[PDB]
Amino acid sequence: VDDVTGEKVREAFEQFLEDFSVQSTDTGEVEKVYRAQIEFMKIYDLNTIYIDYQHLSMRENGALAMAISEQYYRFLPFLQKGLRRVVRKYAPERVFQISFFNLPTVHRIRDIRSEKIGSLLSISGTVTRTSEVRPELYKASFTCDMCRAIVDNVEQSFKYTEPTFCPNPSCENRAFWTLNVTRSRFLDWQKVRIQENANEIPTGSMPRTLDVILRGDSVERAKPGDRCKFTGVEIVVPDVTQLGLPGKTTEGLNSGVTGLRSLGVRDLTYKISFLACHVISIGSDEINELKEMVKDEHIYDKLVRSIAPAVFGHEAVKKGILLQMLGGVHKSTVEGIKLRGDINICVVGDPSTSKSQFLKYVVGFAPRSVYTSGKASSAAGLTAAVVRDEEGGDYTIEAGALMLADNGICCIDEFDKMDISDQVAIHEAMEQQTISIAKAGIHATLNARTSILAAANPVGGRYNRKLSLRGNLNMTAPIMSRFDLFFVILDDCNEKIDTELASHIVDLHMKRDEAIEPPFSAEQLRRYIKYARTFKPILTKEARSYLVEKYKELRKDDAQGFSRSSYRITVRQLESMIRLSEAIARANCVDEITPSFIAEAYDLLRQSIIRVDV
Amino acid sequence: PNVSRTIARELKSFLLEYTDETGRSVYGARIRTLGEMNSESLEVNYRHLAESKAILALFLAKCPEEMLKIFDLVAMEATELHYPDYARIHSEIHVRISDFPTIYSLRELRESNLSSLVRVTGVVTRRTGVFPQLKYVKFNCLKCGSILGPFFQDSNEEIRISFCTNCKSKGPFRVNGEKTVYRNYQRVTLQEAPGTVPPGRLPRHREVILLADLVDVSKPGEEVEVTGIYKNNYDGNLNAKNGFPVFATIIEANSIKRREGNTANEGEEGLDVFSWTEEEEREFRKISRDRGIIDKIISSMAPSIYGHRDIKTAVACSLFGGVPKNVNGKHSIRGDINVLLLGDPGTAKSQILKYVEKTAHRAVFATGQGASAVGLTASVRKDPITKEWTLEGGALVLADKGVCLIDEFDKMNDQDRTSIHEAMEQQSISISKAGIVTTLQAR
DNA sequence: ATCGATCGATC
DNA sequence: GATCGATCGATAAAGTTTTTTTT
Numbered sequence A: 001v002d003d004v005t006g007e008k009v010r011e012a013f014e015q016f017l018e019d020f021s022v023q024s025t026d027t028g029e030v031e032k033v034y035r036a037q038i039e040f041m042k043i044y045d046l047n048t049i050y051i052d053y054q055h056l057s058m059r060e061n062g063a064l065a066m067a068i069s070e071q072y073y074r075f076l077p078f079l080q081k082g083l084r085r086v087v088r089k090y091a092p093e094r095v096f097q098i099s100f101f102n103l104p105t106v107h108r109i110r111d112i113r114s115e116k117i118g119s120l121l122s123i124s125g126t127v128t129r130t131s132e133v134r135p136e137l138y139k140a141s142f143t144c145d146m147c148r149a150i151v152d153n154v155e156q157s158f159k160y161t162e163p164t165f166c167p168n169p170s171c172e173n174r175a176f177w178t179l180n181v182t183r184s185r186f187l188d189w190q191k192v193r194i195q196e197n198a199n200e201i202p203t204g205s206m207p208r209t210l211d212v213i214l215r216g217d218s219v220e221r222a223k224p225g226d227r228c229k230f231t232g233v234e235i236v237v238p239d240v241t242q243l244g245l246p247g248k249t250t251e252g253l254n255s256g257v258t259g260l261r262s263l264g265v266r267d268l269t270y271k272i273s274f275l276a277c278h279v280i281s282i283g284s285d286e287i288n289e290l291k292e293m294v295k296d297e298h299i300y301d302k303l304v305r306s307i308a309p310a311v312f313g314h315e316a317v318k319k320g321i322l323l324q325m326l327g328g329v330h331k332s333t334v335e336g337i338k339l340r341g342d343i344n345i346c347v348v349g350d351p352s353t354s355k356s357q358f359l360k361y362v363v364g365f366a367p368r369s370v371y372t373s374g375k376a377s378s379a380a381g382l383t384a385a386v387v388r389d390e391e392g393g394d395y396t397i398e399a400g401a402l403m404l405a406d407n408g409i410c411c412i413d414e415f416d417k418m419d420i421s422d423q424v425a426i427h428e429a430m431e432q433q434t435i436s437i438a439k440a441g442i443h444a445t446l447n448a449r450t451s452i453l454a455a456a457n458p459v460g461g462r463y464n465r466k467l468s469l470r471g472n473l474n475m476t477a478p479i480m481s482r483f484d485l486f487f488v489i490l491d492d493c494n495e496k497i498d499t500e501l502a503s504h505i506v507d508l509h510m511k512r513d514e515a516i517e518p519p520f521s522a523e524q525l526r527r528y529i530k531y532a533r534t535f536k537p538i539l540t541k542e543a544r545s546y547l548v549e550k551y552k553e554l555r556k557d558d559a560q561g562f563s564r565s566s567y568r569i570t571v572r573q574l575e576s577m578i579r580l581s582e583a584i585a586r587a588n589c590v591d592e593i594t595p596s597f598i599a600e601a602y603d604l605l606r607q608s609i610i611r612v613d614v
Numbered sequence B: 001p002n003v004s005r006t007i008a009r010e011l012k013s014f015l016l017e018y019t020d021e022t023g024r025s026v027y028g029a030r031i032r033t034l035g036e037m038n039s040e041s042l043e044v045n046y047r048h049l050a051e052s053k054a055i056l057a058l059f060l061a062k063c064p065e066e067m068l069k070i071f072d073l074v075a076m077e078a079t080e081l082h083y084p085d086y087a088r089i090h091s092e093i094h095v096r097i098s099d100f101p102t103i104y105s106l107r108e109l110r111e112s113n114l115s116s117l118v119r120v121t122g123v124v125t126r127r128t129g130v131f132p133q134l135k136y137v138k139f140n141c142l143k144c145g146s147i148l149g150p151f152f153q154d155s156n157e158e159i160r161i162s163f164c165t166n167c168k169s170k171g172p173f174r175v176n177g178e179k180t181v182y183r184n185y186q187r188v189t190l191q192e193a194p195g196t197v198p199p200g201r202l203p204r205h206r207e208v209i210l211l212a213d214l215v216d217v218s219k220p221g222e223e224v225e226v227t228g229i230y231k232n233n234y235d236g237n238l239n240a241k242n243g244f245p246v247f248a249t250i251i252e253a254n255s256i257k258r259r260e261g262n263t264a265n266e267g268e269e270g271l272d273v274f275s276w277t278e279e280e281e282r283e284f285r286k287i288s289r290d291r292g293i294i295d296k297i298i299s300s301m302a303p304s305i306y307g308h309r310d311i312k313t314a315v316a317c318s319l320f321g322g323v324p325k326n327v328n329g330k331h332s333i334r335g336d337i338n339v340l341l342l343g344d345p346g347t348a349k350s351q352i353l354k355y356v357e358k359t360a361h362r363a364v365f366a367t368g369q370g371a372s373a374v375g376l377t378a379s380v381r382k383d384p385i386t387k388e389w390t391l392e393g394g395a396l397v398l399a400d401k402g403v404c405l406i407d408e409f410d411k412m413n414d415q416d417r418t419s420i421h422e423a424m425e426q427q428s429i430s431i432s433k434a435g436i437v438t439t440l441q442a443r
Numbered sequence C: 001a002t003c004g005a006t007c008g009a010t011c
Numbered sequence D: 001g002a003t004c005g006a007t008c009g010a011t012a013a014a015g016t017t018t019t020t021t022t023t
């Protein structure tokens, strides 16, 4: 009587696929969304569906959707039969799956006793210690070679590695098998562990866990180490007796009841597990809006006023961080050197000032950009250093805030308090884009494509004026020449600037005084530079002859003698002298370089090298 | 069936009748040359592979291995007319396949990839030695016919039966010792090399089963990439996880090549040709009988850097090398040349060493801090759970022409520099820390 | 050495 | 054809002082 009930829910779901759940006509929301679900599928060939719990609850008014919530451990090989019937009548090698999502409620892992056998229950948590990608079987072509091995049984169970039922002729049944790798189609899966979220533990009371199984295309979508949700079918799996290997406290005490099956007397257990079907991980005219916004005029000056509300003034350093926010060029000469790919700018200043606000600003504003103080200069992190032999091997790679800044903008501060050894290590990491390691293992060829951001401390907390920063750099010489220039933030105590900064901070520190207007928003600026990165402007004019005389004049200035200091701005900086010069034209969306654009390029070192040169 | 018999006729024509790039019989020339060295190998050109897949894409990505078995027997007749009686020595040939237009890492494998051609990279971890493999199972009964012919044993499946074509009893099958040849077998397991990988995560494992004339081409520690087929072995028994409807993974191989560098090419410098057969060796003499070559080569060696001349005189001289001239029962002679640069911070000294790493044949780039005082030379890695203290060398035993950067890592300068200045003085240095007294040879 | 499973023989 | 008896095959084991880099 559940056969016709299974046949009732077969067509009632099929009739639901004939209709839509569309409430608005031609104000958006085109009708018959499930027909278009078939239409997108017959082009890209992904072999999925996507159904929600809402629109099937609001057709039979819960007379049908409440039935499948307690039975679809059995009803799951029923609804697949109906959609397999409707696909030939509506569309032209075909394996599918049933992907519910978005049930209303969300539980924790501590609430699974008796109703959770055959139900659907969305479960939160985090995920740790994944595994690999192996194939599964679900259907055999195996049969004995007595007379003919073409018997195709199906539905290999949790231990059924032996299809031995109903041969064609009266051959030797259950005598043998031969698992054909030809016709028996497979599917791919993995087995990962989960863990409970941090904001629910009462105390440090050994937070328990369980294990899941991902079956369909859902493999590799579950990035480990994030807050995540799941589908919710439950299952129990024993495995103690098979053909191969021979199968504390009184765990498995219920197993003694489970004895005496029709095959050999044993002690079969039953351990709780979990199966999923679908994962999620929480945590036009807009394309025409860029074409309107690219046809503006003063966007170089519009953007610099609209960077950060937590800062006032300092219009020199606001220009520099925006060029750091975008990227330059990286394509270079053939068969050999890969040149620079970016700029690297620092600002030193007195602590507990407006230096710390940009560092707060960028790490949410930038894609995947990490922040690290860089004080733990002992174990790992900034310094790269492998881990000891653990669980099957030494010489394994480690994390740290350079490798995961691959096209990411890392920011480290406090240069003074590190040791004397890493100051060549990151100096190696700065000049080209790879680092090398050979500590007790083979050489490693890893290429952290990075662009750093720095803020060190002065030698006394107050910057002197009449001297240079050659004393006040508080480090060695050649890393500064390896670096770009700075535009150090100055300080003063005037009667006027403190008053306006006081008014600048109180409306910010209001709960709601949003009268300040940045002429852009955050995200429309964010997608704007994503349009800006898709060019490659090349200098084509003959202003390179104009270019070479400026540096040739420039090098005769900072060298104030044959015995003058070794801060001689050499041919290393000429690459930055053009790779910033293209990037500022890459901001204004111009695909070639004019001599007018490099006017702001020349003085930007030069106004800041006269900051060096007294 | 029977139309595959004509397939061998349909490709021996389609291969041997013409080779591209203005004829010259390129593939028709490299056959006899590897016949001369007696080394049992062939190649296929990718552009020929691009042209010999038009009717064969549905016979490469559909059926990769039994297409090759019928592809193997035509190559005998492709050279039997050329070299007669070559089958009387070693009686066997098998082909190898060159590069392929895929870039698969270790992570990206699914069900659609199996029983087809695959290509993947990684690094070689812990490896075994060389065993012989039976390869021709002359089956043996006890009372009936005890010679069932030399079989064709598979991979790790132990292909046998209880009784067939003699009786139906439980008489087991045994062995005997007449004329069973052996190929060898060497199961390198592979770890994913931490290059192109989203970092901060774990490595992943596979297994690789090599074959007969491809043994010990790799060395432990060195980066390799492999081109072969994919296979499955549903053994129905696994004991790390529970027994489950799953199946393992075995990657058999057809070819193997060394680490590559500057992966930006389109048609060259990824396949190690290095095969100076006709168009090169006939050419390379007149380029040697000119009058200003040494004034031309070292000027044209490092093209990207104009600079002062004398370094390019020296650094070209360094990788050209001298001679390890041995002598009678007396002291040996160093056959090496060891330059040392000194530069201002900002001249091009970091690039010539970077560029010469590509233009060499083998190299290493242990630079700066983190170079261990022992990890350059050989070190002993401790045993796993039932093993012995074995010897697993690091940088200098692998590199014959290695490149270090000993500038001023002063905190570790008093550690490692007592272990590099006896690689030159008492050349071929090795050590016996808590292990075996041995002496490896590293020039 | 003991227990379980499979095969053969007898009713 | 089914049931009972006899013979053959498969099933049970255990760890925690020296030595490496590292902080």
Ligand SMILES: Nc1ncnc2c1ncn2[C@@H]1O[C@H](COP(=O)(O)OP(=O)(O)OP(=O)(O)O)[C@@H](O)[C@H]1O
Binding pocket: A337, A339, A340, A431, A571, A572, B304, B305, B306, B307, B343, B344, B345, B346, B347, B348, B349, B350, B351
């Ligand atoms: N003579 C030159 N010709 C061409 N390019 C040069 C020259 N000198 C320096 N450069 C450029 O300057 C860039 C900076 O790298 P550089 O070679 O100066 O590092 P380095 O100072 O040698 O580093 P280290 O001192 O650590 O070895 C290089 O990418 C290189 O292209």
